[PDB]
Amino acid sequence: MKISDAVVSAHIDDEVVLLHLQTGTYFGLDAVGSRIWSLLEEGKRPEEIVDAICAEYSVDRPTVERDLRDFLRALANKELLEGY
Amino acid sequence: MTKTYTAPTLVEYGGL
Ligand SMILES: [Zn+2]
Ligand SMILES: [Zn+2]
């Protein structure tokens, strides 16, 4: 699993803007989504991403695992992720 | 280590 090779990232402070060069679609991510995206850029696997989120936010692990699962799936549906 | 959590969101804002 990895970020698609056709995607370019724009970092504006806390948030991230994504552009897909093939589909020509662009996206914005909120604070938590961008944190996850940064970890994906660093090549972190989901388990490591879950660890990072739980260490920085006041939240139970099952909630994080469930939300991450939904989030990655949403990314993949927009072809922002591949091999997921 | 104690930030307020909200579920990650992907928002599509447009296209070429
Ligand atoms: Zn690729
Ligand atoms: Zn980045």
CB contact under 8 A, B16 and A57: no
| Method for this entry | X-ray
- A11 annotated as a binding-site residue: yes
Which of helix, strand or coil describes residue A3?
strand
Q: Which two tokens stand for residue A31?
A: 């604070």
Beta bridge partners of A18: A9, A27
Q: Give the Å distance between the CA of A55 and the centre of ligand 1.
A: 31
The owner of tokens 């879950």 is: A50
Owning domain of residue A33: 1-84
- CA-closest candidate to residue A16, choices A39, A33, A41, A40: A33
Residue A15, judged by CB atoms within 10 A of its CB (0-12, 13-18, 19+), counts as middle
Domain count, chain A: 1
> How far is A42 from A71, CA to CA, in rounded Å?
17
> How far is B12 from A83, CA to CA, in rounded Å?
21
- Is A18 within 8 Å of A29 (Cβ atoms)? yes
- Ligand number nearest CA of A3 is 1
User: Which chain A residue is nearest to residue B12, measuring alpha carbons?
Assistant: A27
> How far is A46 from A49, CA to CA, in rounded Å?
5
Helix axes A61-77, A31-41, angle to 10 degrees: 70
CB contact under 8 A, B8 and A71: yes
**Distances in whole angstroms, Cα of residue A11 to Cα of each of A34, A51, A67, A83:** 9, 23, 23, 24
